Amino acid sequence: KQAAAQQAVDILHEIATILNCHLDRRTLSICISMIENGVNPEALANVIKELRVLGQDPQQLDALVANYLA
Amino acid sequence: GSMAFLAQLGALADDLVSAIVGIPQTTQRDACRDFVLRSLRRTNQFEVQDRLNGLEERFSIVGRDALADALRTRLDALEPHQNQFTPELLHLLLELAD
Separation between Cα atoms, residue A39 and residue B13, nearest integer Å? 11
Q: What is the DSSP string of chain A?
A: -TTTHHHHHHHHHHHHHHTT----HHHHHHHHHHHHTT--HHHHHHHHHHHHHHHH-HHHHHHHHHHHH-
Three-state SS for B76? Answer: helix
Domain that holds residue B85: 45-96
Separation between Cα atoms, residue A63 and residue A25, nearest integer Å? 30
Per the CB < 8 A criterion, the answer to whether B94 and B52 are in contact is yes
Are A33 and A49 contained in the same domain? Answer: no
Cited resolution, angstroms: 2.2
Separation between Cα atoms, residue B52 and residue B75, nearest integer Å? 9
Domains in chain A, number: 2
- Distance between B46 CA and the closest CA of chain A, angstroms: 16
Are A10 and A22 contained in the same domain? Answer: yes
Separation between Cα atoms, residue A19 and residue B92, nearest integer Å? 11
- DSSP code at position B81: G
Are A31 and A64 contained in the same domain? Answer: no
With CB atoms and an 8 Å threshold, state whether A16 touches B93: yes
Separation between Cα atoms, residue A59 and residue A32, nearest integer Å? 30
Separation between Cα atoms, residue B69 and residue A65, nearest integer Å? 45
Separation between Cα atoms, residue A67 and residue B6, nearest integer Å? 20
Mutation target for A interface from B23, B55, B93, B94: give the one with most A CBs within 10 A. B93
B66 and chain A: CB distance < 8 Å anywhere?
no
Domain that holds residue A62: 40-70
Are A35 and A4 contained in the same domain? Answer: yes
With CB atoms and an 8 Å threshold, state whether A15 touches B71: yes
With CB atoms and an 8 Å threshold, state whether A65 touches B28: yes
